[PDB]
Amino acid sequence: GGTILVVTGTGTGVGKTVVCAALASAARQAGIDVAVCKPVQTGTARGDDDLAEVGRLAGVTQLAGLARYPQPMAPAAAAEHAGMALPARDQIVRLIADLDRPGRLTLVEGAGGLLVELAEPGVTLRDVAVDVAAAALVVVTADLGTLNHTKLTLEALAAQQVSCAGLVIGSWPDPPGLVAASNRSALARIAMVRAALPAGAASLDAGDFAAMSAAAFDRNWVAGLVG
């Protein structure tokens, strides 16, 4: 096996996709073999495709999906409104395990927040993390209410003994304000902040995105993610 990180977030819209693509780029630039995995993908009828956005921004070719649903809602809802069923737990776990390899960083991108149902019955990304023995990267906002939403998320990880790989601020303004700058300070007292991605990172072209991604993370923390 290798290193499996689930990428979840304090919510929806926090920047899960751009953070996967950013970690994946910085990891590749570390010479790490990177796979990215999106077990459950909704909103396809709106053009939502996180794996394609990660392939686009980060040049990851090793991409692996499973469930796709048209409506941009929670997977459970999006499935019912298409006459479709959620994946099974072991359908998700098998998909992760088949990508897992020694020396590979495999990134497992959730849908919405940590406690969203991804599989029947009530199976969360947290349960997937326990099974595949993965730690969790938590993508957060810089905005108002992020401390509560983060505290909740981290607490939920610890209740199931799922280690916290770090926090990533998935969109960071410049110049930052008084509330944002106070949040970033407090977030470092709750957990390690592995990065803060400049807003509109998803607009950068291949090179710029990589140059930013190499800049955003500590090279030592990235390099140390994989034996």
Ligand X SMILES: O=C(O)C[C@@H]1CCC[C@H]1C(=O)c1ccccc1O
**CB of 92 closer than 8 Å to CB of 66:** yes
Residue 111 sits in the site that holds ligand X (CB under 6 A): yes
Q: What is the CA radius of gyration of the chain?
A: 16
Q: CA 124 to CA 36: how far, in whole Å?
A: 18
Span of 57-65, 110-118, 154-162, 218-226 interacting with ligand X by CB under 6 A: 110-118
Strands 123-124 and 117-119: antiparallel
Do you know the residue count of the chain?
227
Q: CA 45 to CA 73: how far, in whole Å?
A: 11
Look at the block and give the residue holding tokens 């607009």.
Answer: 203
Catalytic residue (choose from 3, 19, 24, 38): 38
# residues near a second copy by CB under 8 A: 31
Binding mask 60-79 for a second copy (x = CB under 8 A): -----------xxxx-xx--
Hey, how many other C-beta atoms are within 10 angstroms of the C-beta on 66? 17
Q: Is 121 annotated as a binding residue?
A: no
Residue 133 sits in the site that holds ligand X (CB under 6 A): no
Q: CA 103 to CA 27: how far, in whole Å?
A: 11
Q: CA 75 to CA 85: how far, in whole Å?
A: 9
Residue 151 annotated in active site:
no
Q: Single out the residue of 74, 128, 140, 210 in contact with ligand X (rule: CB under 6 A).
A: 74
Largest CA-CA distance found in the chain, in angstroms, rounded = 47
Residue 178 sits in the site that holds a second copy (CB under 8 A): yes
Which of a second copy, ligand X, none does 28 bind, CB closer than 5 to 8 A by kind? Answer: none
Span of 87-95, 98-106, 109-117, 202-210 interacting with a second copy by CB under 8 A: 109-117
Q: Which of residues 122-151 bind a second copy (CB under 8 A)?
A: 144-145, 147-149, 151
221: left (phi over 0), alpha (psi -120 to 50) or beta: alpha
Hey, what long-range contacts does 79-85 have (CB within 8 A, 24 or more apart)? 85/120
The contact set with a second copy (CB under 8 A) reads: 11-13, 71-74, 76-77, 80-81, 112-116, 144-145, 147-149, 151-153, 155-156, 159, 178-179, 182, 186
**Residues in binding site for Mg(2+):** 17, 50, 109
Positions in the binding site for ligand X (CB under 6 A)? 12-13, 16, 42-43, 48, 72, 74-75, 111-112, 116, 144-145
Which residues belong to the annotated binding site for CTP? Answer: 12-18, 50, 170, 198-202
